[PDB]
Amino acid sequence: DEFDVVVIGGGHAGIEAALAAARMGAKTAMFVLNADTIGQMSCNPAIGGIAKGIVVREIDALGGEMGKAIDQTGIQFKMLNTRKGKAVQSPRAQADKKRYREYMKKVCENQENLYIKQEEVVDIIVKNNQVVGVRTNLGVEYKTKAVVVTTGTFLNGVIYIGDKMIPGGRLGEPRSEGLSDFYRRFDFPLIRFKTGTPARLDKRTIDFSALEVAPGDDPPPKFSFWTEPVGSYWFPKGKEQVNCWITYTTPKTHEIIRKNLHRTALYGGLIKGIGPRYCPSIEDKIVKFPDKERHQIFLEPEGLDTIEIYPNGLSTSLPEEVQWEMYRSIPGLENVVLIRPAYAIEYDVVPPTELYPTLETKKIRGLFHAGNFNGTTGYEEAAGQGIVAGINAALRAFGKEPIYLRRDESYIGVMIDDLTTKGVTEPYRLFTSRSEYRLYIRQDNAILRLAKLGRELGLLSEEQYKLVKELEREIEKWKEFYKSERVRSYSVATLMTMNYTLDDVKEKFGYEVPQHPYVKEEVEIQLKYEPYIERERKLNEKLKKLEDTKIPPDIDYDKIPGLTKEAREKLKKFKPITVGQASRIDGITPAAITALLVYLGKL
Amino acid sequence: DEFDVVVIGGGHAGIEAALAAARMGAKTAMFVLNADTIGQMSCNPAIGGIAKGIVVREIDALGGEMGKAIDQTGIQFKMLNTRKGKAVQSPRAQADKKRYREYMKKVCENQENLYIKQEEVVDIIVKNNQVVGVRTNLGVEYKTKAVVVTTGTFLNGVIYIGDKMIPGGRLGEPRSEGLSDFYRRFDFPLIRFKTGTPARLDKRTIDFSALEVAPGDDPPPKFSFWTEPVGSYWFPKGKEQVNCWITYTTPKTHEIIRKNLHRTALYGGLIKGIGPRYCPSIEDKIVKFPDKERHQIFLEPEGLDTIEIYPNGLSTSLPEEVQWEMYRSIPGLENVVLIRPAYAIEYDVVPPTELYPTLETKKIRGLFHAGNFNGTTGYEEAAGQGIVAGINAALRAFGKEPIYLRRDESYIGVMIDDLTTKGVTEPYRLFTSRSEYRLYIRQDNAILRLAKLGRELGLLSEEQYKLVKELEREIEKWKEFYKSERVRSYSVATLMTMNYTLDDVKEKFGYEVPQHPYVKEEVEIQLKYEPYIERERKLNEKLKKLEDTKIPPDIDYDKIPGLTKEAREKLKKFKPITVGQASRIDGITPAAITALLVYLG
Numbered sequence A: 001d002e003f004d005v006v007v008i009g010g011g012h013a014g015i016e017a018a019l020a021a022a023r024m025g026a027k028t029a030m031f032v033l034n035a036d037t038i039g040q041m042s043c044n045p046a047i048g049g050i051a052k053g054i055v056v057r058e059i060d061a062l063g064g065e066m067g068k069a070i071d072q073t074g075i076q077f078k079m080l081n082t083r084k085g086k087a088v089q090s091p092r093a094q095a096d097k098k099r100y101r102e103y104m105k106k107v108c109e110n111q112e113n114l115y116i117k118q119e120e121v122v123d124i125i126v127k128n129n130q131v132v133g134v135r136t137n138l139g140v141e142y143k144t145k146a147v148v149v150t151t152g153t154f155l156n157g158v159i160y161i162g163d164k165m166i167p168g169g170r171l172g173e174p175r176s177e178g179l180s181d182f183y184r185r186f187d188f189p190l191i192r193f194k195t196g197t198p199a200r201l202d203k204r205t206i207d208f209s210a211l212e213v214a215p216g217d218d219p220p221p222k223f224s225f226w227t228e229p230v231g232s233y234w235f236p237k238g239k240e241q242v243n244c245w246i247t248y249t250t251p252k253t254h255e256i257i258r259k260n261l262h263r264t265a266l267y268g269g270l271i272k273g274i275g276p277r278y279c280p281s282i283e284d285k286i287v288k289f290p291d292k293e294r295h296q297i298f299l300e301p302e303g304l305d306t307i308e309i310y311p312n313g314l315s316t317s318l319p320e321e322v323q324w325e326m327y328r329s330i331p332g333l334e335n336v337v338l339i340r341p342a343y344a345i346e347y348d349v350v351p352p353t354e355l356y357p358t359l360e361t362k363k364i365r366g367l368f369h370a371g372n373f374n375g376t377t378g379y380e381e382a383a384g385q386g387i388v389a390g391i392n393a394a395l396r397a398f399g400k401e402p403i404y405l406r407r408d409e410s411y412i413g414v415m416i417d418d419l420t421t422k423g424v425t426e427p428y429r430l431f432t433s434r435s436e437y438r439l440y441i442r443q444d445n446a447i448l449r450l451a452k453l454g455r456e457l458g459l460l461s462e463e464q465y466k467l468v469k470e471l472e473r474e475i476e477k478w479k480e481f482y483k484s485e486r487v488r489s490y491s492v493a494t495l496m497t498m499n500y501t502l503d504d505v506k507e508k509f510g511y512e513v514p515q516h517p518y519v520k521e522e523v524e525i526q527l528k529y530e531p532y533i534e535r536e537r538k539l540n541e542k543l544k545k546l547e548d549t550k551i552p553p554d555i556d557y558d559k560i561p562g563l564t565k566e567a568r569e570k571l572k573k574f575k576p577i578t579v580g581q582a583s584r585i586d587g588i589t590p591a592a593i594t595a596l597l598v599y600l601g602k603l
Numbered sequence B: 001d002e003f004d005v006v007v008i009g010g011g012h013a014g015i016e017a018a019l020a021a022a023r024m025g026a027k028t029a030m031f032v033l034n035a036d037t038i039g040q041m042s043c044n045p046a047i048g049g050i051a052k053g054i055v056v057r058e059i060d061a062l063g064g065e066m067g068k069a070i071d072q073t074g075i076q077f078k079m080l081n082t083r084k085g086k087a088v089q090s091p092r093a094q095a096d097k098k099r100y101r102e103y104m105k106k107v108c109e110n111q112e113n114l115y116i117k118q119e120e121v122v123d124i125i126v127k128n129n130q131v132v133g134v135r136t137n138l139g140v141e142y143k144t145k146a147v148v149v150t151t152g153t154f155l156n157g158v159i160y161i162g163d164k165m166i167p168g169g170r171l172g173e174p175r176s177e178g179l180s181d182f183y184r185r186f187d188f189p190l191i192r193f194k195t196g197t198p199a200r201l202d203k204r205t206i207d208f209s210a211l212e213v214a215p216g217d218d219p220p221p222k223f224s225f226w227t228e229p230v231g232s233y234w235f236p237k238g239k240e241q242v243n244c245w246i247t248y249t250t251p252k253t254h255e256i257i258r259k260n261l262h263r264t265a266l267y268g269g270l271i272k273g274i275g276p277r278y279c280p281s282i283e284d285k286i287v288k289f290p291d292k293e294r295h296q297i298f299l300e301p302e303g304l305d306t307i308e309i310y311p312n313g314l315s316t317s318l319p320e321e322v323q324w325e326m327y328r329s330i331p332g333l334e335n336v337v338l339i340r341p342a343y344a345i346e347y348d349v350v351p352p353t354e355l356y357p358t359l360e361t362k363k364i365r366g367l368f369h370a371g372n373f374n375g376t377t378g379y380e381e382a383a384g385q386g387i388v389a390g391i392n393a394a395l396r397a398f399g400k401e402p403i404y405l406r407r408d409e410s411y412i413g414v415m416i417d418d419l420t421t422k423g424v425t426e427p428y429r430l431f432t433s434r435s436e437y438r439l440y441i442r443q444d445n446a447i448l449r450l451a452k453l454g455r456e457l458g459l460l461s462e463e464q465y466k467l468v469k470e471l472e473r474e475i476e477k478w479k480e481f482y483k484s485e486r487v488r489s490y491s492v493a494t495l496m497t498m499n500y501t502l503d504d505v506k507e508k509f510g511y512e513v514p515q516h517p518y519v520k521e522e523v524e525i526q527l528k529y530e531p532y533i534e535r536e537r538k539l540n541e542k543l544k545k546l547e548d549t550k551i552p553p554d555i556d557y558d559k560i561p562g563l564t565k566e567a568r569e570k571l572k573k574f575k576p577i578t579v580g581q582a583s584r585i586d587g588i589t590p591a592a593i594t595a596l597l598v599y600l601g
């Protein structure tokens, strides 16, 4: 039959995209190679982290699932980097791979207008650069208005272990092959990225005696402003949480890796690294920091019913023989046994630059990319892209105009922007990026920042938006209050900026305090941070000014006065939507930008 | 008339290349836009540093000048990173920009077979992919066998200040334009890199009262195993040295820069950094490190007779008005005045991958690139490339075969390899690279490691090689000695590994201290490190085994069994010379490498 939107992929990106596009009312066909793998978590057994955490909340705020999901199936939540402030924190729960998968799968089945299909999409049918359909490897064709590609680590994937190559997209699964011809056919740049993962350990064979413990936090935090408790962002003290364990590599582990560097496809270059704990393979951790003698390693539970341990911080592509020797050089694992070997995955990727901040292909209309296929890596980073892609894919199908998240309003917008404008040299991660609005884009205000875009599209219930609209309205009342009261003589509001929690203001000064968990921790923040937020908003006024100046999708970049010839072209290939964006293009200089502003400064 | 080798460039790359190519006996035409700028130091007023230092010694050991140069014209030497060991140290002297320039200039004039030319080369004449000549912007042509391009920051250069563009290759100088058409004509990939430099301050307007002092070291070190004292690597205590001063930025400085990031072509990349002390601009240290509140700044003397201060760690491309406000927000510079504004330079560069480890273009025979035109940045990193390029350009001209420095024998080889094999995304620096033989490629054994390649080519005097061959032969004798003597009863040799300097072995155990200065500090090292050096040599045996397996320049990468089709190609475009090298190519995997090793058997 026919479809409005076809989502090639059942992964994280696929889901969010498919769900949204459907929830917005589009007949959505979500293709998958193996239905039983819908929502499968293939690497670290956790959702959230430094930057990731924030993203989730946004996806949640927007009406996506990833939030709700990790919550109901999480087995160990906690807030990271607690000794710095509330704005610079981020939630990172542990997950039950099994239950998570089942969850997401269940949702997709039970979602109106979302039809699942287990056929490998091989081609994209295009008439005059407009998506018209999709064709599977079973000689079947389908009529669709929009397509959202999210192949992740599958397109012509190759598993690397030792010096062995094995066709596939994930250890044990097949791979996709056909769809790449369509891409080379139309001349999209194709490049390959390869990432690694740690093997899987036998819990039974590990010695958890002389090892630290990383419990969750009580009360534990929650990734959704929709789960129970509703409207809140926390779990009632006393929830069941599992424990992770910590061991460290040793001088011997290294000598082992070193001895076999010529046997691993993850032996990157010898360049002074960004940080011991920013590098992927454990092979880098010793190539880039030839002076550190031990790196932290997180043994993580993959679920409740499983004896499978995840040795976080130990991904590699060393021979399997070697993989044993080195896993057993670690304290606690001297007798461990592997259930699945660690390995490396290489896969086809189409440079983000080939898209607009709407995630729509510049060359073809109706085609949207997202996920690892977009140069990213991580469940979250991928999820973020999906929802945007899906939302737009929908609108594109519906006959409306695509939307986009500004880099100064959602940490997602940041990613999508850093991607469609600066491209990628290696897999793009979030805990690598920074926001020129690190204080306005917090891990809490998220719901407030995006909730409206939500209700606007439909991804958010009418009733849902009111709880937000209502909760917020109240957050400012309580603030206008502390602003007017006094205590020299300062304002209670002005107090939060002096290590004054709305809890010390209730005791030391016997004042009232908000009676809804969110409004209290929210009002407490906004007031403690309102100053710094402004200094920040100010130091960027100029930047925002640009980001606010729109550039027509028709202007001829030649009719532009005193605009270098070289830049005339980059400006035609990126077709920036805002002057600000146009200024972030590498090559386009302040000089060029002015000459451009002048042009527009007549029109 | 005609030439064997034409060296387009009078910069550092140009020099070493030109000098060598000529010293080896080739009619060498070294072209320059402005003769008075031969050997001009355009950025930091110093030679050496973390990685750089070592390179120099190598170029010195090979017969290049840069070493000798910095020595006789240096105004403040010193060894960096002294609290870690002797192998992990590196010499970094301050220079007298003026004196240095004059020096190198002098040398080139007085060098047999080296003819200077102040004409802008515009084209390279090629018949059947073979360099046959060069053509200047004056409608003149020249017959040459080889060409060594080293345009540095000039090919279609553009100076950026605030939002102003100014054609040129350096503040105040012109630029090159024509030569780039030759490159696009033949399909070379052309990309642009831009770097920045700090302005220049009026020494008279600075307050050097409440600021630290960074004197040289006594005795100070020397970058040449040829200057005085000969054979040694040290200067007799008591030499004249200048002093640098240290101030730090302030929270205000930053708010200034921040306020003006929309007016500086150097702002970009919210990516987390590798350390503040590693970024170029100062507009970075406040974008990549939004939490640090003060960065060290080294006020450095540009010479003896000059009142020009170099604010190390403050390069920027901010408007000139802003440049004032932010230079005057710094402690000591509240009243300073600028002589030259700081700025940014953007310039044409042809991706290194377009060359072999011999620095010869893959597409055209007889054409060699080097310097910043090759994706590099820095006097040293550029110098290193030149000498190799020149050496080969020579041999190519002479009708012999090009040579190359292996990555496990010279830190230079490292650079050249990191470049011709992994290409560049941004300007390549040395203090960013690491060597899988950090202990065997030290800042002293250099002379020993390369000396022979030197005499082999001619760049080193016959009598020069003997001093080396002789000094070395003696370094081992004295070792054979400490190895056999005892003390339970360990060996004196085995003692150096226990914080035993051949100085404590002369006092505490009344033994004999070596003949001359080098043999003493050398034997003292080699013995203190002989262990670690071996553990290292071993952990890499496998890697070297590959690096030793040679790949014929003829083999059809198709006739190779079970070698993925995608890799068949990359292996065609890099035409690796070594299997080891072939393994460093991004894309070529251990899988592919084995399938290859099988083929070759």
Ligand SMILES: Cc1cc2nc3c(=O)[nH]c(=O)nc-3n(C[C@H](O)[C@H](O)[C@H](O)COP(=O)(O)OP(=O)(O)OC[C@H]3O[C@@H](n4cnc5c(N)ncnc54)[C@H](O)[C@@H]3O)c2cc1C
Residues within 6 Å of the ligand: A008, A009, A010, A011, A012, A013, A014, A031, A032, A033, A034, A037, A038, A040, A041, A042, A043, A119, A120, A121, A122, A150, A151, A152, A153, A154, A155, A169, A170, A171, A175, A176, A177, A179, A195, A196, A197, A280, A343, A344, A345, A370, A371, A372, A373, A376, A377, A378, A379, A382
């Ligand atoms: C080996 C390995 C290493 C990793 N390393 C890291 C890391 O270092 N850091 C990090 O953050 N994350 C890492 N990850 C996580 C990775 O980012 C996610 O696993 C996932 O691939 C990203 O989400 P996605 O939605 O793009 O794709 P996926 O979740 O992988 O889903 C892709 C889906 O597309 C379908 N598909 C593929 N081709 C076709 C086709 N032609 N037709 C129809 N359907 C198709 C598949 O069935 C699959 O369901 C790693 C994963 C692996 C497997």
Ligand SMILES: Cc1cc2nc3c(=O)[nH]c(=O)nc-3n(C[C@H](O)[C@H](O)[C@H](O)COP(=O)(O)OP(=O)(O)OC[C@H]3O[C@@H](n4cnc5c(N)ncnc54)[C@H](O)[C@@H]3O)c2cc1C
Residues within 6 Å of the ligand: B008, B009, B010, B011, B012, B013, B014, B031, B032, B033, B034, B037, B038, B040, B041, B042, B043, B044, B119, B120, B121, B122, B150, B151, B152, B153, B154, B155, B169, B170, B171, B175, B176, B177, B179, B195, B196, B197, B280, B343, B344, B345, B370, B371, B372, B373, B376, B377, B378, B379, B382, B383
């Ligand atoms: C703005 C700026 C920023 C810098 N930043 C850094 C930094 O961050 N870190 C660092 O280590 N170093 C930095 N440097 C130093 C720089 O790397 C060296 O000055 C130089 O580029 C390296 O040596 P070279 O021989 O390749 O080129 P150059 O020293 O530039 O010399 C090239 C020579 O070739 C001649 N020439 C050019 N084109 C032609 C032609 N077509 N025909 C004939 N002759 C020609 C010129 O006259 C010139 O003398 C910077 C320099 C500048 C100017």
